[PDB]
């Protein structure tokens, strides 16, 4: 009944490993783009289907390589994913937001033929780490056409984002870079009450949790992207009636769980 549905009926276990699509990569050179620092596109092979696109930003001091595992993980479950480098590693969240926007325009207009053939540019979403997660929250305000946003251990001095884009924030309980009491939790709390929102807090986790393979980050990020980018309600089960021992906290307004 759902033309955007892809891949197997999900199990939680399967969402902790790479999915059913082999992944190709394309290097976007820094010089070839004005609007971000280039990056890497991860995209499905062995298929004639089309898939939603995701732009992902790294955080302060960080390169695209710091999220390579997660770009590959997402693409392997059926997405076209551009992980950027920023123009400067010292760019702040709102700059990263604008670079995510440039990245999405590039993906739609300028990517190689093999990538374009796999991309349904109607269906786009964003994610990012730390200051990149701050950028994800800002671009969600700016662009209500986005299907979803996943800020990962996000950092921003602005605590209130007026967005109608469905947001799932991952906090890291023990984060010392973007402490959850000052960043993730206020971001959650202050999103509109009418916007689908989830907060998942990783038990005893550090700021660096998103920079290596992480089961809970994989489960929730895939699930949120699937639910909203693909309308894939097979993933509601991981996002509703949640009692997850990997988490120190879970919050939602349960709009997606009627």
Residue 60 assigned ligand-binding role: yes
Alpha carbon distance 97, 56 (integer Å) = 10
Instruction: Please identify which of the residues 94, 175, 230, 232 carries the catalytic annotation.
Output: 175
CB 169, CB 195: distance < 8 Å: no
Residue 199's closest CA among 209, 210, 208, 191? 191
Note down the domain range covering 111: 1-258
Alpha carbon distance 170, 190 (integer Å) = 15
Instruction: Please identify which of the residues 66, 101, 111, 130 carries the catalytic annotation.
Output: 130
CB 142, CB 71: distance < 8 Å: no
Instruction: Please identify which of the residues 77, 156, 207, 256 carries the catalytic annotation.
Output: 207
Alpha carbon distance 78, 69 (integer Å) = 15
The sheet that has 247-252: what strands, in order across it?
A: 23-28, 39-44, 80-84, 51-57, 119-129, 149-152, 167-172, 197-202, 247-252
Bridge partners of 126, per DSSP, are: 55, 149
Alpha carbon distance 142, 208 (integer Å) = 27
Active site residue 223: no
SS3 199: strand
CB 127, CB 135: distance < 8 Å: no
Active site residue 130: yes
DSSP strand pairing (23-28 vs 39-44): antiparallel
SS3 144: coil
Alpha carbon distance 196, 191 (integer Å) = 9
Residue 183's closest CA among 217, 136, 230, 244? 136
Number of H helices, E strands in the chain: 6, 9
Number of domains in the chain: 1
Alpha carbon distance 205, 180 (integer Å) = 11
Q: Which residues contact 222 (CB under 8 A, 6 or more apart)?
A: 10, 15, 19, 73, 74, 77, 235
**Domain at 25, CATH number:** 3.40.50.1820
Please provide the size of the chain in residues: 258
Active site residue 22: no
Alpha carbon distance 201, 180 (integer Å) = 8
Residue 56 assigned ligand-binding role: no
Alpha carbon distance 230, 41 (integer Å) = 19
DSSP strand pairing (39-44 vs 80-84): antiparallel
Resolution in angstrom units = 1.5
């Amino acid at each position: 009944s759902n033309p955007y549905q892809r891949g197997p009926n999900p199990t939680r276990s399967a969402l902790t490993a790479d999915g059913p699509f082999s992944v190709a990569t394309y290097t976007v050179s820094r010089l070839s783009v004005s609007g971000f620092g280039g990056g890497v596109i991860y995209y499905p092979t062995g298929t004639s289907l089309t898939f939603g696109g995701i732009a992902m930003s790294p955080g302060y001091t960080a390169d695209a390589s710091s999220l390579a595992w997660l770009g590959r993980r997402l693409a392997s479950h059926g997405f076209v994913v551009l992980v950027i480098n920023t123009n400067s590693r010292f760019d702040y969240p709102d700059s990263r937001a604008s670079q995510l926007s440039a990245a999405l325009n590039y993906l739609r207009t300028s990517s190689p033929s093999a990538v374009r053939a796999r991309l349904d540019a109607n269906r786009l979403a964003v994610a990012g780490h730390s200051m990149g997660g701050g950028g994800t929250l800002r671009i969600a305000e700016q662009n209500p056409s986005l299907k979803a946003a996943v800020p990962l251990t996000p950092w921003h001095t602005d605590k209130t984002f007026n967005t109608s884009v469905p947001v799932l924030i991952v906090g890291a309980e023990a984060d010392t870079v973007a402490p959850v009491s000052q960043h993730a939790i206020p971001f959650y709390q202050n999103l509109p009450s009418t916007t689908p929102k989830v907060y998942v807090e990783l038990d005893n986790a550090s700021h660096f949790a998103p920079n290596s393979n992480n089961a809970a980050i994989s489960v929730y990020t895939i699930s949120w992207m699937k639910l909203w980018v693909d309308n894939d309600t097979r993933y509601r089960q991981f996002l509703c009636n949640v009692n997850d021992p990997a988490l120190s906290d879970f919050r939602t307004n349960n709009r997606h769980c009627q």
